[PDB]
Structure 1
Amino acid sequence: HHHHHLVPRGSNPPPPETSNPNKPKRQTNQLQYLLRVVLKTLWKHQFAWPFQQPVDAVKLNLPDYYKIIKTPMDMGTIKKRLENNYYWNAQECIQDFNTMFTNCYIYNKPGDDIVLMAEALEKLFLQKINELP
């Protein structure tokens, strides 16, 4: 038989939402700080780049990524959420950062470059979180 299963192909999942008109939203001092200080400082760090967009499993040849990671999250998504006032409180935003870090620790191994990057960003995150109003 001449069906060799070269199609259908994979794809990335759709990315997490950044707008939801029926979701309750507020602007708090803590969320403004999360955008103005926490996010915007992590974003400029030399280790931010793998975390600035959803994991593109196709491009990066990570065909198992979305077999393993069911709640993807990245700082591009977090940044678009903050810009769109998507959140109700700081806790929602913080859980997204925690998700992103945890995903990286699940998928990869202790000592991997990506994990060293994640660990460093998390360190800085935790320090900036201690300065929250």
Structure 2
Amino acid sequence: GPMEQLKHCNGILKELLSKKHAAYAWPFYKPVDASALGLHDYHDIIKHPMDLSTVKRKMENRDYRDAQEFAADVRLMFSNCYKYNPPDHDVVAMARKLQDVFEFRYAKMPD
């Protein structure tokens, strides 16, 4: 049921935040600070920012009702990166590597 599937989601989230993936996960740890990065168009282009700390807070607060809602947020975070940046940018390469980790483990979701 949803509670058990959400445990698997929490396991994925913990893995994405773990040292094992830190070389390419680090940009996604916290909300994009557009002003600090000089990305003064970020909030005009990205209507729904997302990052792993926000996913974690939502999981901790039981905001996600099912695994599909969790997966939509994780995928939104990657999509924002693919939307904002040229496809050859280093941050896009990092997003793609982390999303591979996510999608292959999300596919192992139990019944």
Q: TM-score, normalised by structure 1?
A: 0.76
> Could you say which residue in structure 2 is the equivalent of 1:105?
82
Which amino acid counterpart does residue 95 of structure 1 have in structure 2?
A
Any gaps of 5 or more consecutive residues in structure 1? Answer: 1-26
Counterpart of 1:85? 62
| Rounded Cα–Cα distance in structure 2 between residues aligned with 1:31 and 1:59 | 34
The answer to whether structure 1 residue 42 and structure 2 residue 16 are counterparts is yes
Q: Which has the larger radius of gyration?
A: 1
Specify the alignment match of 2:50 in structure 1. Answer: 73
Q: Percent identity?
A: 45
- Greater RCO, 1 or 2 (C-alpha within 8 Å, sep 6+): 2
By how many angstroms is 1:58 displaced?
1.1
Unpaired stretches in structure 2, ≥5 consecutive residues: none
The TM-score normalised by the length of structure 2 is 0.91
Identify the structure with the greater helix proportion.
2
Q: Which residue number in structure 1 is paired with residue 4 of structure 2? A: 29
Q: What CA distance in whole angstroms lies between the structure 2 residues aligned with 1:29 and 1:78? A: 17
